[PDB]
Amino acid sequence: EELKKHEDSAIPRRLECLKEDVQRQQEREKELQHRYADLLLEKETLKSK
Amino acid sequence: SSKMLQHIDYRMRCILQDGRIFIGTFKAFDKHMNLILCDCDEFRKAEREEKRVLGLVLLRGENLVSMTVEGPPPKGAAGGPGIGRAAGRGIPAG
């Protein structure tokens, strides 16, 4: 009974941190891909010359 | 005409020939630039300053010098045949 309450404490904590880890990596992905998309576009300006 | 007509029903500030000021809601004008101002104040100019009230003032055109604005004014497709209702789907055989 006690163990379940500690598990009930642990499960949101594990969910909170790991989802935040995943979320930051997606935020990292969004920042990376935004720059990376722009630089090909920049390369196309160079290619246009 | 057309420039003056744009101003109508606004709250207009007039400067008379003697130096006085009127402020009034504006609804008439005429070929001699007669005016009817309405809901109106007489206003004169620490240098002392004062504010008297007048009603429905009719201004003989000779006096007017200038007038100015400072206020905003003292102011589908038919329903169609469709109906929604609750329904089941019903799978066919096979």
Partner: protein, 81 residues
């Protein structure tokens, strides 16, 4: 001839005017009438001695006016026709 018609062609240039009672306006102009009735927009005032004021639009009766002050940005020659 008929210089008041020259004062309608002049539209949407810029002017100072001094009125008769020592008033000065500084304005860009749109609209004028047969009896010289002036209307200016983008209006900066200066009364007699009293300090400047700035106004959205100002309409000035005809017979209060004295001299305009045209800009040097007029080539005059066009007025002959």
């Amino acid at each position: 001839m008929k210089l008041v018609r020259f004062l309608m062609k002049l539209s949407h240039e810029t002017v100072t005017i001094e009125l008769k009672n020592g008033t000065q306006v500084h304005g860009t102009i749109t609209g004028v009438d047969v009896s010289m009735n002036t209307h200016l927009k983008a209006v900066k005032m200066t009364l007699k001695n009293r300090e400047p004021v700035q106004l959205e639009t100002l309409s000035i009766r005809g017979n209060n006016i004295r001299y305009f002050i045209l800009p040097d940005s007029l080539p005059l020659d066009t007025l002959l026709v």
